[model samples]
Target: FKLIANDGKADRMIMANDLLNDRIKSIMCLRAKQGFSDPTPTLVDIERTHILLINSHYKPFAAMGYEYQKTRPNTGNPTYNSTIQFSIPQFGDFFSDMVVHVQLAATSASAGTVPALPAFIGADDQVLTSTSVVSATENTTSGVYTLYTQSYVNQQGTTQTVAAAATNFVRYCEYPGLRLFKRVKFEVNGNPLDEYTALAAIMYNKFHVPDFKLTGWKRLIGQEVPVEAASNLVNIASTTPWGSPIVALSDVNGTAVTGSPVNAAITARKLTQVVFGAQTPKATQEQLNMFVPLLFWFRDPRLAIASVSIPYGQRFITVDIEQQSNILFTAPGNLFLQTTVETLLTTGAGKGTATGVLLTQYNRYTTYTPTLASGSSIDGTQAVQNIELYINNIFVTPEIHDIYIKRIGFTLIRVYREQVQREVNAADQVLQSQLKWPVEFIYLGLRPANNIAAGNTYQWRDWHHLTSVTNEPVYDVSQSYARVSIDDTVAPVGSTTFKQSASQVMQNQYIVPVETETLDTVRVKAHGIELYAQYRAQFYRDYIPWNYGSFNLVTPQDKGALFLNFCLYPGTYQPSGHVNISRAREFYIEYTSSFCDSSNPCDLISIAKCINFLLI
Candidate 1:
């Protein structure tokens, strides 16, 4: 047993080489250290802490190892009997200096003001208020507004007058309250350790971590989520994208001149892009095609754009570039216009202000099929043709004089600004301990390097690399093209079975770095319209383990995305006859369709591999 020398600072503890040697077996930490108190009114006021154990090199002490991450309970402190045993025997002979860091963070404000979370959605547009002269305003506002006719003929050909409106700006939650990390980085002497540390951690956490509470990580280090939710609300274990709003369009109120008359003006230039105070140019068709704006609710994700045509004599100049959609719309989420008691007698561009436009739901599954085989395809036929814009009851289109290739909607720019603040302030608050104490422990355990024999003097330490290739032709055992359907009519069985060696199937053979590299994980994804269209069609991988010498099919399976994590460290480490990527062996993938239909044949899109290596 070793006593952790209690220094003056409760947050950091330094341990000696002797304490980290093989003889040292375990560690003890406080849940809520004594004397830390909060005056704010609450039922359970115990301090929550997150701890990290690292060497002088900042290497984690264990794999997915963290403590006290369970849901909050009424108990304050556990007895001194609480301790964690070491899974890997201490290697103090190599790591001479190490540190134990104790961090405490509270959701409540203790010292400085709690950082303000970005508003999930914008409020209804406020009408221009008149109160004569003033040098400055009391507070600020969010997003811009556009102008359009208030009355028009409905599809039934009936005319009705209503208050003009614009798209209610939705704020981007860059680092939403739930996503615990933004960038998981590693550095050595102020330089990047690897080009893909963040991505490596993300892939590991997503594929390897099995459960939210069980995996010791609620979310990956770089994933972006917008709003908070209960456990299992989203299947975050896989790479299905979540939260970040695909489209954010605000009003177009023209170039910056000087001041008032139409709507409430905001202090901060929230949506300024291109120049210091230039109006964000309308979103372009290219942006719509690339980004799937509609969130996953039913059918394939759609790109919902709002536009209106201006009748200039005989030709029509249509302004149809504002894209809109939302994942979390606050309360009675519905797309509608609000009526405010204000009418502009002035004519021209500033004649009428568009405000109070909102969208809470959208779906046209009947026209567009559910199998979205063509990912990110644009479906503009539904609502794009219906939203007509008329100025003074006459169709009008704004002139397009500028080159707007990188142009985005007004709401997107404003929310991007908000997201930056969220990252900055949140980073500052947590690092500065402005909110008081901690929440979870993130322990990274390192594996003891296998003892080397006579001449090979290489060591495996800390370098992670990933490589991927796509669109390889598939062939059956007879060397003919392998064709599989949703119903498996052209089934891959016996003589018709699909087979390909790793070298033949992949565009380039993965040359594992000699001696120093270990293959950690492999992710396989299949692309085909029929299989994609089918709801239950899944992909599977069959492989022989390095030692087992027996093919085990169906190890890891998914609808279209599949991955297998090869445990290679403290868990799968073998002392004798250990096999690694450096060993000469043949790798092959055999394919068979599960629920694949005739039209939707199984086609290989890509195969990705993660290799762990060392520097120097």
Candidate 2:
């Protein structure tokens, strides 16, 4: 029998709970495959779905409420209330218990979309129901219990339609103790069900239209068009050429030096000459007509001087030489004033002062002469032997004048005086004693004298015959003392002259000679061999090895004996073959040998060997 028990109507609650669990599992599985990998659903996903559903169904309602609120004149009016309402259903409940209070408030309708259901919706519910089904049989009833549901909705002011359903409700309840059936079922029957439904209700009563007003965003009420002061504008005139002042006749003075005006007459006359030729009369009348006006305009005297004036002036005078001479002599002289002292001084100074002594000093001294004495001689003689003599006498005389002397004048006479004699003694004698003195004399045999005299004015004489005596010789008393009233006298002499002569004599002389000497020689001993032999013996004992210099030789008969004596000998050496099996084995026997040894033995060595071995 298909039995159904209400069990306080918990079957619908359990079915609704199962539907929510199934939907959450499907979402998690999809998210896991997309690399999310989290088994549990996040609050962000749930909240996002809630907000999306509300926006999709209630956006038009919210927009209409916003417009109505903007149009209302005053929010204080009682009928001008703007409110919003959203509703969801509770499952496993009677018809009176299905409605769930969501949100209701007098919020500014301009608030964009209504906020999601508040926490109070879950806490405070006048009709709360559980999504638990007590009997599995009732939950499994085919027609009575629905595992899937769907619902369609048409919004108030929008042409859009929305429909949603949960189709895996039966398998959604597989989790233990999960109340999947008792959750809210949003639609009446199971044909098409909306598992979660939302609504937003906004009430607007007053209707007022806002006027089109332009806020004085950037303009003033009473203001004139702004303008800065006009820039300075002026007319700049071009510069004028103001010349020198014009003078009147009163400004001029009659004196030529004071007011020397320009030679206008001479200028006019020159102008005529410039325009007319000198031979204007010789020209044709046509030519005269052409040049007369130009000649008058230029006023050149040169043209008239040659054509008429020269011939007319010559006709009035005849050639007169005397008159011409007077004219030439009376011609004006080209005189110029000589430069004055002030002019020369203003230019530059003259030459400088003269050098040397004054001319007055030169005229004062007239002549010069040397003084002479009686004993002084002009000749250079009378000098001591080996002594140098120099006579540098300079005598100067003042002016000498000519004078006259006469011996004929005798103007005075002289008188004589008497002489007085006192007494005369006949026998009184005035005696003067004369003492006799000895005289010593040294004699030298006279030789020729050296005399150098010239022109009888100068002389140089050498007394060469005089000897240098050692001692004075005493005169003999017996012979020279024969003073029998003998009188001897030496006379006073003048400077004498001598002649030139020389003498030479020789005596014995001696000289010594020097001599040289030599000594004997000996032979050297032989020591090189002895010294070298000692050095060789010392070096050989110090460094040389004895075994290296031995004389014993290894004979053929002693070969077997040596082998027997020495057991340890060098090993027998042999050359290796081209094919080395040891090297090939080393490469094939490693840990990774499977490829080289068996799979590809050819890699290590040649395969031909293996094949030949197999055949063998």
Candidate 3:
């Protein structure tokens, strides 16, 4: 045999010297000389690129037992053939890296068949109106759904619309044509290599994951507005810009609370004049202009067997992948992974109501009137003890106030598949299908989240500053640190450390399997520049996957987890972010705030890792 260069230099090559020791990337051959021909082959095109891999290096090393492969000679080939077999190769030092290039199949808007994607179903198993079924090639707009609109009464006493709802609907979609498969198997001839040890060698390389894959975009929630000033801006008579008209003030018996001071103020739309005082901002004013965290509920089987097929000669190769469910909604939300929006809206069930707590307090204050009885009055003087009918202190404001609250609504998911434009008589599909087996993907199913069966796996375990309650997580002042323990025996808030036994500690150090069921991401609501931020996370392996943020807090978002994942396992439609735990000894949280003292207290909220189990 001979090897040639572009300069017409030819060198003799030996093919019979223990070729079994060599590794083959691809067989580069001259069409005419290799006994294969194409009538109108392009100058840069090869008649047929035979993607051949010696040995059974098809399955990921860890998944070898589950996969099988077989091989045989191409009898239809014009070249000499006799039960032929290609041997693994021994390469020179230059064989350091293997580059795999991929191009997605072209999908037509009209001719493509639609796939049955997982649906966002209600308790009755019926699909909701929020999601739509479509082809992979259809171009869709983001935030096209309107949750609500803002309308108000003009000076002429006629209602008019203002500030329409846009950019509020959360969108979900599959990574265009990207499949995170679970059970992948292989075959070569008419049979499977199930009895043989299928070991294949491939080089490892590094790539970066995009931010959108982990942190989705943001959407509108609710807003805080000074009742006094906002009353003059929009008249406050009809649908105010803040989502709804004043909710009718009703008594306990469901009748209208007419003649009440708060009711009169609301009816006349002069809440500031009689109810909330413009002069006293702190006593009566309600802070608006804020943003709230969003909860994302992805469809179940967060990890599943994704199936795909490829063409080979007259047959097809089936690749099934058992995807690792390592994604999380760590971008900052009230409930990190609540399965339903209803659970969140229902108070005490999860983080409830995004607004109205301040208004409830304001109404109670204005409704009270001091009176004198026999020398003193008990009932009239104390404002009836400032009763609160129902309230959940969780506060979240939207960037835009027009978002409706009655039905927060379902999210939209979309899928895509085209890498380039299609052309007539193109073999793009054939080329894409042929390259499937040679390209490899690494799957790590073990995740970092809380496994509630063992307890301690939490989304956000509530911890109060300056207080040490027995058996509850607390911010320890003596050590100037906040430590959440894994040890069950250490009372008064578990142990700051894992265990005391040296042998137990050594064995559990890397052996007990780093608590993959807990979260490493910390959610902090502080007075910092970014009022609410997440102290980013690292996978339990101690590997910091991306570099979006290391020192600064990652700003949280409602829909930030819904995005087209382009990097993490590329060609994937990832709907969640990764907030896996770090090594057990490294689970530490440090927070500094001047307000969290005896006079004022701050609460540290940590979402439970086990919350993911709720997404069915």
Candidate 4:
């Protein structure tokens, strides 16, 4: 490979152009190259192979196991011993913080016999010794056992002692089943044992118990098996774990009490008032207005008082007069001459009765007769006025009221019109300037005279006029902040074509003349290309598996497993081979253990250790 020269001189420009042309031809040749023309069936073949692999590797297993065991028939009867013994030591400090009193039963022979004190026995027939070091004496006559020495130590290392005079006794017996007792009394022959009844007792050697006090009586019971064992009799855990499931129900289409119930009769009353003339009662002016439009209207002209007929010579008049006014003339009886001008002037157009009727008729006539004089102009005239008139005065008053209401309604309409016009103008301005070149153009300039002169390059520009008719500036600021343009010129032309012909010699075996070379050039110029590059870096850190080395040994694994197993299976786990042989032997030995030492060889543990050490 040869290195290319890096210089601005145009000495080898033509050679560089030839090299670029060869590179473009090589790229075209690479695009025409072909390989692996058919790939569709190859992908299908691979997918089929994958499906076969999955079917061979993925298999599911199916099996079933019993959920519950069937009940078996009884094989043999359970054997039980009645003479078994259990010891429960009485402690003075059990309820030492509590103060107590006693209630005594009458020690009368006539009183019914007291029940025997019930007791609980363990599985073995081991005798229970008295914990009290200070012996108690029994009252032979009364069959009562009283404490003879107080503050005596019990076998259980507890310092609970009964007072010498206090009534205390341990009654023991074996029973076949569990029994409960609220109170206990002792008896000898047929006599009562003590002055007071026993409130509570406990079989602590065989069962766990709570503290006791003697002030109040408490029920105590004992059983051969654990109390929780009774739960086996009832399968509540499987039947109703917490209790039965709760359910609620309602009809899907039933009516809901969402609001007040619909009253058909009340609604019908309102409809009747709207359809018929059953008016709703009104109690205020606003309520009265609701009914006014439906209840009032003008009477017909044909039935009006003015339309009634009267005889030609006889006059008819209906008048209402007060004591303050007097009638000076009667219509048809008194002519215009009979009434004095002074009386007519004082009462105005008509004095009383028929004259007043004539004045009202005259007013109605002027309304239709536009050319007639007003009442003020014909003050004393006793003229006959035609009552027949054509006027729409009834509608005129209501029309005027409607026009007043419409004037107030127009004010709100004007406000809405102005708001709509402002939005339309703003929208039109945005559309007109959306794509204009002046809004989008950005310009930068340079001055060859001074490098600092380039700092005042204008970014944008807009034309302005100083006067209404002429474009001149009365005062102007430099276009330093506006977009400026540099001086550059080029001619625009339409498309034109030029052609040149060239020939090249054939390289094959055909006989032909040598070829020649030709050149063609095309040029284009515009703004320089803008180049940009962006970079982003990401990093991550995490702990590796090799970080743990301390807990990798067998000893640690064994210790962890032991701890976990201890947690899973807590408390006692004694095997059958480790049963206490000494305890079994004690049952046969009884009180004769001190005399049977030679035959039993109680030092067997020391003899075995010496022989094993010698062999090791």
RMSD of each: 35.5, 87.8, 33.6, 65.5
lDDT (Cα, tens digit) per residue for candidate 2, span 212-272: 2111100111001222333222222331122223221233464344342232222111111
Model 4 scores a TM of 0.10
**Top TM-score prediction, candidate number:** 1
Go through the candidates in order and give each one's C-alpha lDDT: 0.20, 0.17, 0.21, 0.17
How well does model 1 score by local distance difference test?
0.20
Taking all chains together, each candidate's TM-score versus the true structure is: 0.21, 0.08, 0.18, 0.10
Candidate 3 positional error at 500, Å: 85
True lDDT of residue 7, candidate 1: 46
**Model 4 Cα RMSD, Å?**
65.5
lDDT of 2 at 209: 9
* Candidate 4: tens digits of C-alpha lDDT, residues 1-616: 9755434457346345444445546544554464434423333343432323243344553221112111111222211111111111121111001111111111111111111111222222223233222233323333222222212222232332222111111111111011111122222223321111110011111111222321111211111121221222222222322232321222467644343222222211111112111011111101000000000001121111111112212221111111100101111100000000101001223223222211111100000000111111111222111111111111123444355344533210000000001111101111111111111110000011111122211100000000011123232212111211222342213211111112121111211212110001101111221111111100000111112112211111000010001011111121111112222221110011121122212110000000000000
Q: Model 1 over residues 1-616: C-alpha lDDT tens digits?
A: 9766544555244433343332222221222243335323221221112213542334542222111111111122211112211111121111111111111111111111111111212233423212111121111122223221122222232322222211121121111111111232222344422122222232333233443332123221112223433343232233333333321223367544333223223322222112110011111111110111111011111111112211112221111121211111111111112211222222223222242223111111101000111112122221221111111111112222121112423210000000001111100111111111110101111111221111111111111111111223333212123233333455545422233221111111222333211112222122211111212112122222122212211222111233322333311112212213222122222223322224322222222222232221
Candidate 2 C-alpha RMSD relative to the actual structure: 87.8
